[PDB]
């Protein structure tokens, strides 16, 4: 990564490498993997980002989909930036991905004035590809999340919003689901109590009631 | 396209 | 976070990230989670605070409540701080909105700018205050048992009884006047007949040390 | 904590936080918990000391007793130091003082070590907790029928450390009660050595 | 709103 | 390794040593071992690279093949080219002070990165041989999920057109109907 | 401890504290505990040394013996170094008593003063010498088996016999007599082979013979 | 150890101490223990080297053999480097005896002195050379199986056979080695290996019987 | 009041 001490390059630490590998092994592709990737790749170069992705062993179907998403964004970068004095040459789509660019060039762009953050741009493409994977790997739909007979309400609502997070719908659709579907699919003995509270109740009041 | 999973920020 | 070496920005460490994830998984929302959050988020920016909250996998019901609490505090900040229109004499720097403190509509550059200014506007500490305020409401709900239901067993040690009482009292988070009212009468009342007779013999204004030493 | 690099403030490390939590979980309130607390809170501010105490999940009975002990010492500080800014009892405890004020006092010339003063109150309160949590009394510690003398002496001084008597009372027990409660076989040999015999000589004799 | 879990502060 | 503070030498850490030994024990010689070696050997000297290879206990057949690959690259360096020899880059006939001298020179001669290239080249040959199944034998089952089939295909391909051919009669017809240009995402969605 | 960066004081680390506690719990009082104590207490002040000893939970019989040994060495220091009834010179500090070296009657500031003085008075290394002297006496006492009782089995490997011999011998003492005793206590089969090699035979030659 | 920041002394870390103890406990005296010792003792003083050896609990037979090897090398150093009698010049140190290099009769200040001198006398690296020389003799003795006894089984994979071959060869550390591999292999693979001919690489040999 | 568990120092 690139960090202060002037901005200087450092080797990716064993702790960071191990941390990322264990998250992918344990959590597979749960929503919380994306923020953990972003956090562990703080100030990372395209090379460091490639190192993290390449160290993942399993899930090779998902990693191949990520490759194709990167190539689509790289091609889109080349379309929006046509190739055309004493000036530094601009990065291509493949140069941002780190396939056709050395470490010295990557550090060059990032520590330039003005800077061209190829690490953050490439990280944006990776996160965009990972969002598509998380949506596909979502096991259950929001319509199927329904409270059990003897299931605690807390556990039911956890499964609801966990699923809602993984589906990654728009905020307008999420509200439409939360408004109509949440109370509907609750079991009778809890639903009897929530109806007694009346409309315009917060999530805090609802969870406290069924407890 | 998906809306992302970053609840905060 | 922001730390000395001049105040400079550092990336959040793998140790800190993992430590926060494990304590949420293991302890769920026990009272001791809140001091651990504050400790691990020492000198943290709004971006760092969002990173820690987003990395939490489970408890998505609780995280949705926390999201609403932040929005309420953010709206309250906008109400108490109106946007100035006319004068810009020095001129002064831009004032942070509620969304800028939360980190939703502000870059890392801007966050570092406010925190390292003179005078400083500690958006990290202000935002942490809102998070802790929301987390307290979650801990109160996740409290398993009520304070009134905690009663000593037939042959239970008094030490183990008192541990469960003050663990429950800490979780519910009542007022200091309400806590002392319950601590005065409810603690001795809910103890077993054997210890109850001994505790009253000490009389009013007896410390917890004297009460525990007696029933032993 | 406050450390050198000029004295500068640092955030309490995850290692130090976790280490303190595990010691409390594992050892409960054994005598060796107090030196570990003092070591882990090296150069700690009142805020850092509160952080360590607040991170403890269980033993809420003990933590409530510690809370009362701190309030007594804080009240005693207010009494001995009248107002006429100088730190009050609540400022040293960290309840009514910011981190900047705490650093201000500790790095001042002359320095007012609010961290070390507050640590003194916590250790004083923890000593009372350790004394209460002691299971067995020193009078109950007797040598077994076929128990080695080494094992008997371990239990004797372990119990003696927990109760925390005065040095005059400890020496009164160590001299008389140690040989008194030993078994008849070793007791005869220990008396043959005579008065003023070192523990090394006593343990070597019954080996 | 609740008081707080911070027993020392 | 060589790192900043001016470029200065540091001793290889216990964490890095242990991390490398464990990945070799756990993952044997899976494709993801090579990027991990490159990451853990960041800014490493020829001495440090030898240290990491020598600390490996088992897999001595693989380590012997790696020795031969290094000797071939070292001999090739001598044919193509104080100036460092092939053995000096490998770290067999060169002290630590000489290795630091070349790497921190102006202009610099990165003997560490050159020697790392030879090791990775040799390690790729080992990963290829240790691949259990061939790409041609990876075929989808009659009642196998398409996601699982694609996982096994690109796992096998990494170690060593054909994906659509080797799919089951039902899914194959659907994938062929989409035609060339269909992305893997679109292919997996179709047979879900 | 006191370390460079000028000699400056640092707080004893959680790693060093936990490392020492675990060694005492696991190895009790085996000979290899003493070198580990010396290593973990590198550049330690008298306060740091007391911190390490106080953190030990069990073995209170051994710690009490160590307390008496320190008092004997402290009293011996006071005898060899008389008190100078007079004022202290400028740019100097008081000469350390036996109790000051132990850390019972001296502040951390005074301890740092003596250790970083020119010329330096290494109170930490002097006090560590007294502790190790007391710990050796404990290791000798806690040694279960005597050197005379260590004899080779009927069909035991010679390596295993030699391991137990020098393991016990290390504990009993914390020579020509020890060399001759090794051959005498060996079984009739190997003893005949060892004598055939003759005098001045190295342990490598002895172990290679009976194998 | 001695490290940069100028060359300065640092205390041996708990990680390095624990790492060395665990490797000796787990791997006993397998060939890979020697490179690990050399790595963990990077820039170590004679005191640090003694600290690592003394912290080892078991294997006291092996540690006693290591003592004798050190004494032999120490005595040899004294023979090759006679005693410089008389007073020592200002701004100069005494010539290190064999025992001074071993760290038995020399203080830490003297050890740091020699190592950071100009010109430097690396007593740490010289002593490490003696320890590794002694450890190599222990590894050769502790090898359970002989290279001649290692042969391929009736239906054993060739990959597993070669792993056991070069594992044993590494411990014993004695044209002949390559021919012994092919000659000790089973009839099925031996026929295929001889078809490749002389001067064949191990890659070609393993691929043929896979 | 208690004396203290600090046996050394
Ligand atoms: Cl495809």
Residue numbers in the entry:
A (entry chain F): 1 to 5, 9 to 87, 93 to 219
B (entry chain M), E (entry chain O), I (entry chain P): 1410 to 1418
C (entry chain A): 1 to 5, 9 to 219
D (entry chain B): 1 to 5, 9 to 87, 97 to 219
F (entry chain E): 1 to 5, 9 to 84, 97 to 175, 188 to 219
G (entry chain C): 1 to 5, 9 to 177, 183 to 219
H (entry chain D): 1 to 5, 9 to 177, 184 to 219
Article sentences:
Here we report crystal structures of assembled HIV-1 CA hexamers with peptides comprising the linear binding epitopes of NUP153 and CPSF6 and the two antiviral compounds PF74 and BI-2. To attempt to explain how these diverse phenotypes are achieved, we carried out interaction studies using a CA that can be assembled into stable hexamers through the formation of engineered disulfide bonds at the NTD-NTD intrahexameric interface. The structures reveal that the binding pocket identified for CPSF6 in CA NTD is actually part of a much larger protein-protein interface that also accommodates NUP153 and is present only in assembled CA. The complete binding site is formed by NTD helices 3 and 4 of one CA monomer (referred to as the ‘first site’) and NTD helices 2 and 7 and CTD helices 8 and 9 from an adjacent monomer (referred to as the ‘second site’).
To understand how CPSF6 and NUP153 interact with hexameric CA we determined X-ray crystal structures with the same peptide ligands used in the ITC studies. Crystals of each complex were obtained in two different spacegroups, hexagonal (P6) and orthorhombic (P212121), similar to those reported for the uncomplexed CA hexamer. The cofactor interface incorporates a structurally dynamic region involving CTD helices 8 and 9 that was observed to adopt two distinct conformations in the orthorhombic crystal structure of the uncomplexed hexamer. Comparison to CPSF6 and NUP153 complexes solved in the same orthorhombic form reveals that these cofactors selectively bind to one of these conformations, which we have termed ‘open’. Binding of CPSF6 and NUP153 to hexamer in the ‘closed’ conformation is prevented by steric clashes with loop. There was no observed interaction between NUP153 and CA N74, supporting findings that mutation N74D specifically abolishes CPSF6 binding. Unlike CPSF6313–327, which forms almost a cyclised structure, NUP153 residues 1410–1417 form an extended linear conformation that runs from F1417 across the face of CA helices 2 and 7 from the second monomer. NUP153 interacts with helix 2 residues P34, I37, P38 and S41 and helix 7 residues I135, L136, N139, K140, V142 and R143. NUP153 also interacts with the end of helix 8, where it meets helices 2 and 7, and hydrogen bonds with R173, Q176 and A177. Interactions between NUP153 and the second monomer are essential, as shown by the ITC experiments in which NUP153 binds hexamer but not monomer.
